[PDB]
Design a protein around this ligand. Sequence first.
Ligand SMILES: *[C@@H]1O[C@H](CO)[C@@H](O)[C@H](O)[C@H]1NC(C)=O
Ligand SMILES: [Ca+2]
Ligand SMILES: [Ca+2]
Lengths: 82, 478
Amino acid sequence: DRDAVCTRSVTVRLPGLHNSLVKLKHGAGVAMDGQDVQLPLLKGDLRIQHTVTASVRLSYGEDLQMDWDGRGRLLVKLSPVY
Amino acid sequence: SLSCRPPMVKLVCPADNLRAEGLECTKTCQNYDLECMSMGCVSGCLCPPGMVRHENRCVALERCPCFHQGKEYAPGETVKIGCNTCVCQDRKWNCTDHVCDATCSTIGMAHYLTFDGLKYLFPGECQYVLVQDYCGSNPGTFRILVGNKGCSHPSVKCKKRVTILVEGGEIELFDGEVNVKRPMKDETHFEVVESGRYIILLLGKALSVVWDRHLSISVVLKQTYQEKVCGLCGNFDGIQNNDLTSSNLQVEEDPVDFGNSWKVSSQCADTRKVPLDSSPATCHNNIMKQTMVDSSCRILTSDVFQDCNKLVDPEPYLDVCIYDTCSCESIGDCACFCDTIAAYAHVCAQHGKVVTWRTATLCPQSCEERNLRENGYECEWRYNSCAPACQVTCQHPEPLACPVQCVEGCHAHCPPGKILDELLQTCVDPEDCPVCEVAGRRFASGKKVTLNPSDPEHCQICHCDVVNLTCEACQEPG
Ligand SMILES: *[C@@H]1O[C@H](CO)[C@@H](O)[C@H](O)[C@H]1NC(C)=O
Ligand SMILES: [Ca+2]
Ligand SMILES: [Ca+2]
């Protein structure tokens, strides 16, 4: 159908760290700057880990969360500082 | 290959810089302020840094237009949204800050559109506070109320009753006419303009009411209040998701528990939480009829409304159409359908889009009976699509504060040199008006008001009933 437009991927960009570029892929996969990565990924600020072992969760600082973009159910949590 | 055009120059990915933002991040006028992803450039030919692409033309200056409704606007051009003008100076629209005049409504039997804009469903059968000012920590000037009977299920039943309580008064209306049970003190602000299909009704500097003689209640307020009111229409603050603050000072999520907080009689019946569904009672398990109603409510999305659909979203006014005329058992009067579309056409008229949607096989609205009392058929009354509501008459010769630009209905039109009076149904020459001009100055046609209360020594009163050039003597206090 033409009335069926789902989300495939989402791209996150953190100018605070390297001006990097995270990418949540159509699976539960993540790819920083082209490089696939094993979870967890404790860098300084951002943590990426599974939740139920079937869904990724980004957490930059204490003012940002995310959720799985595998089959297209992205979420965000923005704290009142924004 | 193709040597690209003169106005732009080709790029090459350097092997060192990862930031090869070249062909992939082609900056057009949309995506300049927006930030772009890029892996590496391509073997394309991109405009210089000082200019951008614009519909197969690398427009040089940063003068490219400012889009709205998917339409071009050159820099300097203006747009009129609401009561504000707005001109995209550089590349962003630059609007004024004159807040406009809000408007409740009662679209159909059981729906309500707040000031800030929130349609919700509330079928009730008691009397309810539509809007008031005595809210928390305020004086409490006006207390417009509304009251319905047999109106939980829309039908040819559900006549509304409206009791408005301003300046210690009690003027109320039902069954077509308006009735004064208690006249109010400052009669100067009072006014009634029975023009067309409506009863326009002013009450002050910053209050007005409209009534289509059948169900609709469109109270209009000015900039004066700005979070001084509350009721079923909300608080008039701009915030659009706090219009469910009940009387007990908390936001609720279910509107059927909201309006139950605003009933006057605290011992009548509170309405029942209906199980939610896309099909009302008649359209429940009658999927045949459910399509004949859906199609007929697509007049709201038709060739004649295409101009307004770009300004006013019809999706709110369509949900009301399917809801009302399912529940309504329309037999002789197809008014539970013809009144939900007129409510959309009038909103389209306020934004300057007059519409003629009404034909002989759909909601006819004749106007021939007013041209009957005279044996000679002069034929001045006509159905006019949207005519001005605030004109000059023998009863209201001066121009009034006009909250409504134009209105539907039967309008009397005759050649100039004649002015309309309502008692004698036809239009008549100006001299036949009972007009008053005492001691020279221009004013109304002899309003029944006692001017000059302020100063005793300057108590020089001059009434005028219809024509008399008289002045009355003041009774001294001593
Ligand atoms: C908007 O217009 C005002 C008044 O002319 C001007 O001061 C201001 O710079 C303009 N702002 C933009 C974004 O164009
Ligand atoms: Ca509000
Ligand atoms: Ca105009």
